[PDB]
Amino acid sequence: VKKNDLFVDVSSHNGYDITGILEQMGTTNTIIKISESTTYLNPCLSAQVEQSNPIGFYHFARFGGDVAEAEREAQFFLDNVPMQVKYLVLDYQDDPSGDAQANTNACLRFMQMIADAGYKPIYYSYKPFTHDNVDYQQILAQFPNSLWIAGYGLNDGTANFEYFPSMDGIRWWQYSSNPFDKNIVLLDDEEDDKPKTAGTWKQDSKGWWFRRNNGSFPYNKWEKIGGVWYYFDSKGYCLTSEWLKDNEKWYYLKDNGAMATGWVLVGSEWYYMDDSGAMVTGWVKYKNNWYYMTNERGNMVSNEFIKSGKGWYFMNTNGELADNPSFTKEPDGLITVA
Numbered sequence: 009v010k011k012n013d014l015f016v017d018v019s020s021h022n023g024y025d026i027t028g029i030l031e032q033m034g035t036t037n038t039i040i041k042i043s044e045s046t047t048y049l050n051p052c053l054s055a056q057v058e059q060s061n062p063i064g065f066y067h068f069a070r071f072g073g074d075v076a077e078a079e080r081e082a083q084f085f086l087d088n089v090p091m092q093v094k095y096l097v098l099d100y101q102d103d104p105s106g107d108a109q110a111n112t113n114a115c116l117r118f119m120q121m122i123a124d125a126g127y128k129p130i131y132y133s134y135k136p137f138t139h140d141n142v143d144y145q146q147i148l149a150q151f152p153n154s155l156w157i158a159g160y161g162l163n164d165g166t167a168n169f170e171y172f173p174s175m176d177g178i179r180w181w182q183y184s185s186n187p188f189d190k191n192i193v194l195l196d197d198e199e200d201d202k203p204k205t206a207g208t209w210k211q212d213s214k215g216w217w218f219r220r221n222n223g224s225f226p227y228n229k230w231e232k233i234g235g236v237w238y239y240f241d242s243k244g245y246c247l248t249s250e251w252l253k254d255n256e257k258w259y260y261l262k263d264n265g266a267m268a269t270g271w272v273l274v275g276s277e278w279y280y281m282d283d284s285g286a287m288v289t290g291w292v293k294y295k296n297n298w299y300y301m302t303n304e305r306g307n308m309v310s311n312e313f314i315k316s317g318k319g320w321y322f323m324n325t326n327g328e329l330a331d332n333p334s335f336t337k338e339p340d341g342l343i344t345v346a
Contacts, residue, residue, distance in 0.1 A: 009063055010283050011270055011346040013193040015039060015180075017066065022188060024055040029188045036061040039097060039191075044068035046077075046084045057090055064095030066132065072103050073110025075117045082121040089127075094197060096127040097156060101134060104141035112142040119151055128198070130180075132156040135173050148177040153195055158182040167192055167343045169295050181345065194346050203234040215245035216265060230254070230267075237267035237285065249274075251308060258287040258303050271344070277310040277325075280344065291341025298339065 009015065015037035018026055030036050038060040041050045044067065050056075067085040071077035089096065098118050104111050119129035131147050131154055138144050138157075148154065155178045161171030167183040167190070184190045207220040217225050217240070218233055227244040230237055238246040239254075239261055246265040251258060251274075260268040260281060267285040271278055271294055279301055280288045292299050298320055300311040313320040319333025 009037060009193050010196045011193055012344045013037065013283075015063055015191050015193070017041070017182070017189045017191060018052070018056050019068075020050045020052050022052065022056070024052050026056050026059055030060060033188075033190065038062045039064040039066055039095070041066050041068065041099075042088050042090075043081075043085050045070040046080050049088060053090065062091070062093050064093045064097055064130065065089055066097035066099045068102075069098060069100045069115075069118070070103055071114050071118070073105030073107050073114050075110075075114045078114035078118040079121060082118045086121070086125050094128050095130050096122045096125075097130040097132050098122070099132045100142070101132070101137055101158075104137070108141055108143060112146050115142060115147060116150055119147070119154070123151070128154075130154050130156050132158070132182075134158040135175060138175075144175065144177075153177045153179050156180040156182065156191075158185075160184050160186075165190070167345065169293075169343075169345060172295075172345065192343070192345055199235070205234040207233070209233075214243070215248070217244040218246070238265045239267070251306075253306065258306075258308075259285045260287070270346075274308070277308075278312065279308070279310055280342075288342065291339040293338075293341060293343050295345060298341070300339075300341075 014033060014035045016029055016033050017039040019041035040053060040056045040062055042053060042065045043049055069081060071081050098115060100115055115131060119131065122129040129151050135157060155175060157173045157175055157178050159171055159173035160183060161168045163184050163186050165184050165186040179195050180191050180193055182189055182191045207218050210217050210219050219225055225244045226240040228242050230239050239252055240246050247261040248265050249263045250261050252261060260272055260274060260279065262268050262272065268281045269283055269285050271280050278299060280292045282288055287303060289302050292301065296315040298313040302309045312323045313334055314323055314329060319336045321329045322334040323329050
């Protein structure tokens with residue numbers, strides 16, 4: 009998954025048919041509860057897996073500050089993972105011991121076991137609980153960017169940045185439990201690897217071209233190099249800082265030639281590209297500000313509305329804001345947080 013992707017998490021509380029909530033959410037990405045303590049198994053697991061695309065599984069911790077107990081709970085959890093996924097989650101939100109350090113050590117041991125088993129560990133919880141029961145900085149120290157934090161705000165079923173939890177290392181954000189658990193991704197998954205790069209970059213008077221291993225070079229085409237997409241013109245030079253229309257969609261090649269994905273600054277304007285690099289039109293929110301972007305006839309426009317209090321103010325390209333808000337009722341567009 010990538011920044012702003014969405015996923016739902018479920019347990020027996022969601023039953024044996026989760027097709028509905030997945031349709032409502034608009035995604036099949038799930039994180040399913042497997043176990044709790046050392047004796048409980050979510051009976052809806054097989055069904056929920058069958059009906060979705062799990063990106064991970066979670067375990068409801070009952071070990072408190074007991075390291076030996078944490079180890080047993082972790083093994084029971086591992087022994088029941090039904091399929092390979094990138095993440096295994098430690099849901100630590102209840103039964104903490106009075107010793108905050110003990111709690112932390114137990115959580116660290118649980119997470120270390122998940123790591124040793126070949127998965128990426130994730131600590132899930134809510135801010136105040138974490139503040140009062142563990143030293144999350146110690147957790148992040150051992151496992152960077154491993155937090156999945158819950159913060160619902162008004163809990164009206166939508167992601168409202170005003171109540172975004174303020175903590176370091178947050179990878180995912182459970183923004184609501186109304187009607188079911190909703191989550192948005194803050195960081196792309198890690199890709200710990202050594203890119204191959206089947207060739208050598210060459211820079212001449214005109215620009216950059218790529219000499220493939222066989223001596224040829226890409227021209228009039230998209231080509232992924234070192235795991236990055238670039239577009240080469242008719243003469244073999246990759247485009248830089250340029251808009252490109254390809255197959256009815258608009259892409260933007262950045263100053264380094266790489267295809268833009270997510271928010272990208274073009275000049276002084278903000279545009280948003282989906283994970284495929286294709287521009288997204290209409291209303292898109294970035295944290296607290298709203299943008300209405302269009303590309304009719306290749307005329308790229310980014311209408312920016314800056315939030316201030318309970319209102320949003322249109323900003324003229326001259327950088328001047330209106331005296332009064334343009335709107336106070338937010339449009340129902342795409343919500344991004346990173």
